């Protein structure tokens, strides 16, 4: 147990994870090695783009923020889900026809189709 | 000496035939 | 269409991946494969994908020169996977 | 940068059916494709094989991408020996 | 005919000069290359130009235009070649599994 | 102040297959997609310019965002000559720690 696998069990214990597989700590160290060597990948591309010698802290600060949109994109925020809902929640509920049998969407949104197959010649 | 002067004659005719006028485009 | 005329060249072929293995991984993907020629086409297309990664790793090993037995070490597979969309990054020397 | 392939590329476009007088902004495009093609076949060639530029790794990229670049590099390496055998 | 013989002359005799590509590659490596590298690298780039112009004349024949090649047929030529993997970019780390 | 005007978009469909129509549900979505991506490019190319401690957006940092993320090389502009490619700046600490993985493995 290295000092960063001894600290990876502390992080999962600080969460609600008391019983985990022992393969998890080997997996959470490969993710933590792939992440810092992808940030420092982009932090070396940005140091050469500004034409400097070393990798300063403002390069790593940009490399963190410029890959929080594609590598770790988020579920939509609460201020956006409220505005999408409150215009959807204002149209009234439609009425129901009395006898329509199976009630289904139009035929281009359902999965009912003639569903062919090849002639096994 | 024959290889040195005849190499530039394959390229000298490649500046007389093709690309007489220079054009442009919008 | 080329996909039909290729399938006549598949009646003499038999892939390494069995039909029960491929026919199970299509079941987790969302359908039960009824025609057993579709199972012989997704297994061949996935056998060809392994047979180019394991072949680019061979030519990566035969380009470092040792000529008796070729070991599939991670040093030959990791550059050979990056030509496709598999980017592994394994650590060493955990401090 | 100036254009190092302005007069040579006009002969080549005529060689593949363009015109005797191509536009200037079309040779502007093709001159930047070639400088990137030689860069993106040398930046990837100095990691394969060794950290040099031996031509035994230039022939690796041409297979499994386009067979015309491989069938036209085996002709330039064969005909180098048949043009030193004649001397 | 009399234009096909002139066009076949330019298809074979045209080449990038070896005195400039050896200057161009050595500005990327740092030290030195060999003559059999420059002979091959000057030959692949002629195939690559012939990969674009033969395909940019397919863009022009598809649309309703004539043989003079506008840049509209040339940006479309690089777009169709890149979607078939022909144009290599070693700065885009691609990912196939999602 | 709109950048795409539904006639340049219609010719973009006519150049692919001339017997093809889009719906107004698709046209209103393609317009949105274009504008949204115009922002995505600029919001992540301004930070490349301001990191170079400059206040002008050059073409050399709209290049680096499209190549690295969107897989787009726009040909007809030209760059400066690329510097000699540094291959491996492997440090001494890695040269001595990796010389301990082999020392335990074979000896």
Structural contact between residues A40 and A46, judged by C-beta atoms closer than 8 angstroms? no
Residue contact B18–D14, C-beta within 8 A: yes
Taken as a whole, chain A contains a residue count of 121
D71-77, long-range: CB within 8 Å, 24+ apart, which pairs? Answer: D72/E43, D72/E44, D72/E46, D72/E47, D73/E40, D73/E43, D73/E44, D76/E39, D76/E40, D76/E43, D77/E36, D77/E39, D77/E40
Nearest CA in chain E to D35: E24
Please enumerate in sequence order all residues whose Cβ is within 8 A of that of C30, keeping only pairs 6 or more positions apart, or say none: none
Domain boundaries, chain F: 5-107
CB distance E10–B10 less than 8 Å?
no
Measured between beta carbons, the chain E residues lying within 8 angstroms of B18 are 10
Tell me which chain C residues have a C-beta less than 8 angstroms from the C-beta of A117: 34-35
Find all residues with CB under 8 Å of D36, minimum gap 6, and list them. F73, F75
- Test D48 with C52 for CB contact under 8 angstroms: no
Residues of E in contact with B23 (CB under 8 A): 68
* 3 state DSSP class of A25: helix
Minimum Cα–Cα distance from C76: chain D residue:
D48
- Residues of chain C found within 8 Å of residue E94, distances taken between Cβ atoms: 85
Give the distance from residue B14's alpha carbon to the nearest chain D alpha carbon, in angstroms.
7
Determine the distance in angstroms separating the CA of B6 from the nearest CA of chain E, rounded to an integer: 13
Residue B23 DSSP SS3? strand
**Residue A15: φ, ψ to 5°:** -85, -165
Query: Which technique was used to obtain these atomic coordinates?
Result: cryo-EM
Q: Are the CB atoms for D33 and E44 separated by under 8 Å?
A: no
Q: Which residues in A11-36 are b (16+ Cβ under 10 Å) and which e?
A: eeeeeeeeeeeeeebeebbeeebeee
- Domain residue limits, chain A: 2-121
Phi, psi of D23 (to 5 degrees): -70, 155
At what resolution in Å was this solved? 4.1
Question: Smallest Cβ distance to D11: which of B18, B22, B23?
Answer: B18
């Amino acid at each position: 147990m290295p000092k960063d696998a001894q600290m990876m069990a502390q992080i999962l214990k600080d969460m609600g994870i008391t019983e985990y597989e022992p393969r998890v700590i080997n997996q959470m160290l490969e993710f933590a090695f792939r992440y810092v060597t992808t940030i420092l990948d982009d932090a070396k591309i940005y140091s050469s783009h500004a034409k400097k010698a070393t990798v300063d802290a403002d390069d790593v600060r940009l490399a963190i923020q410029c890959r929080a949109d594609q590598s770790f994109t988020s579920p939509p925020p609460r201020d956006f889900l409220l505005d999408i809902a409150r215009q959807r929640n204002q149209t009234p509920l439609p009425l129901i026809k009395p006898y329509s049998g199976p009630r289904l969407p139009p035929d281009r949104y359902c999965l009912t189709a003639p569903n062919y197959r090849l002639k096994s010649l | 000496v024959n290889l040195s002067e005849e190499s530039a004659r394959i390229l000298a005719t490649n500046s007389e035939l093709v690309g007489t006028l220079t054009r442009s485009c919008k | 269409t080329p996909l039909v005329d290729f399938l006549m060249q598949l009646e003499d072929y038999t892939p390494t991946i069995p039909d029960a293995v491929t026919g199970y991984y299509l079941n987790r993907a969302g359908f039960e494969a009824s025609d057993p020629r579709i199972i012989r086409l997704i297994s061949l297309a996935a056998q060809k994908f392994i047979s180019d990664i394991a072949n680019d790793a061979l030519q990566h090993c035969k380009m470092k020169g040792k000529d008796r037995k070729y070991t599939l070490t991670m040093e030959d597979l990791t550059p050979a996977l990056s030509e496709y969309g598999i980017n592994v990054k394994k650590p060493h020397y955990f401090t | 940068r100036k254009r190092l392939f302005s007069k040579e590329l006009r002969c080549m476009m005529y060689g593949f059916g363009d015109d005797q007088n191509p536009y200037t902004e079309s040779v502007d495009i093709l001159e930047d494709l070639v400088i990137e093609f030689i860069t993106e076949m040398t930046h990837k060639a100095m990691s394969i094989g060794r950290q040099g530029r031996v031509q035994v790794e230039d022939i690796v990229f041409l297979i499994r991408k386009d067979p015309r670049k491989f069938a036209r590099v085996k002709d330039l390496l064969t005909m180098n020996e048949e043009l030193k055998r004649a001397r | 005919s009399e234009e096909q013989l002139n066009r076949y002359e330019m298809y074979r005799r045209s080449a990038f000069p070896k005195a400039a590509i050896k200057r161009l590659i050595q500005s990327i490596t740092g030290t030195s290359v060999s003559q059999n590298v420059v002979i091959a690298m000057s030959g692949i780039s002629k195939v690559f130009v012939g990969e674009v112009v033969e395909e940019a004349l397919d863009v022009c024949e598809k649309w309703g235009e004539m043989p003079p090649l506008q840049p509209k047929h040339m940006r479309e030529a690089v777009r169709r070649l890149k979607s078939k993997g022909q144009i290599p970019n070693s700065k885009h780390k691609k990912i196939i599994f999602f | 102040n709109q950048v795409l005007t539904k006639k340049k978009l219609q010719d973009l469909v006519r150049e692919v297959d001339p017997n093809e129509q889009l719906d107004e549900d698709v046209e209103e979505m393609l317009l949105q997609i274009a504008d949204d991506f115009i922002e995505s490019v600029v919001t992540a190319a301004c930070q490349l310019a301001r990191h170079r401690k400059s206040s002008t957006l050059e073409v050399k940092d709209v290049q680096l965002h499209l190549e690295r993320q969107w897989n787009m090389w726009i040909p007809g502009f030209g760059s400066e000559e690329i510097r000699p490619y540094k291959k491996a700046c492997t440090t001494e600490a890695h040269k001595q720690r990796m010389a301990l993985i082999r020392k335990t493995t074979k000896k």
